[PDB]
A paper describes a structure:
Mucin 16 (MUC16) overexpression is linked with cancer progression, metastasis, and therapy resistance in high grade serous ovarian cancer and other malignancies. The cleavage of MUC16 forms independent bimodular fragments, the shed tandem repeat sequence which circulates as a protein bearing the ovarian cancer biomarker (CA125) and a proximal membrane-bound component which is critical in MUC16 oncogenic behavior. A humanized, high affinity antibody targeting the proximal ectodomain represents a potential therapeutic agent against MUC16 with lower antigenic potential and restricted human tissue expression. We describe the crystal structures of a single chain h4H11-scFv and describe its interaction with MUC16ecto composed of 26 residues (31thLQNFTLDRSSVLVDGYSPNRNEPLTG6th; numbering from TM) to understand the binding mechanism through the comparison of the apo and the MUC16ecto-bound scFv at 2.36 Å and 2.47 Å resolutions, respectively.
The VH domain of the scFv is composed of 11 β strands (β1–β11) and 2 short helices (α1−α2), while 13 β strands (β1–β13) and one short helix (α1) for VL. Our crystal structure also revealed that the straight distance from the C-terminal of VH to N-terminal of VL was ∼ 32.0 Å, corresponding to a distance of approximately 13 amino acids (∼ 2.7 Å per aa). It is worth noting that the number of amino acids constituting the linker region between VH-VL must be more than 13 residues to prevent an inactive or aggregated form due to the insecure space for interaction between VH-VL. The VH-VL complex are likely relatively independent of each other, and associate only through the interface. A buried solvent-accessible area of 926 Å2 (calculated by PDBePISA v1.52) capable of forming hydrogen bonds, an energetically cation- π interaction (∼ 5.6 Å distance) between cationic sidechain (R44 at VH), and an aromatic sidechain (F251 at VL) may improve overall stability between VH-VL. In contrast, the scFv in complex with ligand MUC16ecto showed only one melting point at each pH value. These findings imply that the apo scFv (VH-VL) has a higher independence at even pH 4.4 and unfolding of the scFv can be inhibited depending on the MUC16ecto ligand.
Author numbering: 149 to 384
The structure:
């Protein structure tokens, strides 16, 4: 039951300055069996899905400019940008996978002046209703990756809700959706579904399917490809 805090919540700087953002974990994230700090960092610009910046506290994701680096171990972590740029405006979140899957509250950074996951099926419903968001996968071997649904509630916070394993043998839910939501996958047609029942206003969010990444040296404990996000609005 790990709580991550981030600081500062918000700051504005000028192009080219260095910034450091911190992430403090209420409990150590260094896993002694695996040798790794199960902590990742995401950048989310407005109107887009999160993008994986760093995992294992310090390993930069492929394709990320090297002005981004991650540091720290145990309970205190840091993301720094050496010479920030205009395209670096976004909210930055840290994310631990030591116990379940939980995100920090985010740091909003302002500047003072063929893998595809296409989603479908959001919309409006009233409390008690049901909806089914879905995720079509293309451009990679769907049946090798575990897949996850995480949402962005209006209040700026990301929240993991469900995970299904690569072959579909193992299924995990957040307590906040357990018994109401049902995740499923079909590895024959490369699709992922979230069947949502007994919807409540707290369920209103942008909903993202996302691929649990892994490499030749182990799972990232992070998600490297996200769909575009479909809105779910619980009514009245």
């Amino acid at each position: 039951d790990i709580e991550l805090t981030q600081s500062p919540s918000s700051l504005a700087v000028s192009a080219g300055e260095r910034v450091t953002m911190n992430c403090k974990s209420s409990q150590s994230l260094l896993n002694s069996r695996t040798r790794k700090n199960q902590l990742a960092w995401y950048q989310q610009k407005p109107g887009q899905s999160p993008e994986l910046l760093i995992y294992w506290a310090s390993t930069r994701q492929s394709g990320v400019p090297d002005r981004f680096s991650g540091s720290g171990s145990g309970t205190d972590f840091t993301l720094t940008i050496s010479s920030v740029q205009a395209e670096d405006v976004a909210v930055y979140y840290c994310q631990q996978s030591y116990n379940l899957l939980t995100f920090g509250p985010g740091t909003k950074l302002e500047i003072k002046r063929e893998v595809k996951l296409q989603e479908s099926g959001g919309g409006f419903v009233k409390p008690g209703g049901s909806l089914r968001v879905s995720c079509a996968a293309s451009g990679f071997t769907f049946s090798s990756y575990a897949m996850s649904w995480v949402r962005l509630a209006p209040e700026m916070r990301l929240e993991w809700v469900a995970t299904i394993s690569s072959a579909g043998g193992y299924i995990f839910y957040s307590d906040s959706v357990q018994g109401r939501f049902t995740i499923s996958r079909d590895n024959a047609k490369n699709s992922l579904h979230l069947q949502m029942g007994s919807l409540r206003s707290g369920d209103t969010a942008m909903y993202y399917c996302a691929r649990q990444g892994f490499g030749n040296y182990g799972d990232y404990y992070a998600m490297d490809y996200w769909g575009q996000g479909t809105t779910v609005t619980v009514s009245s």
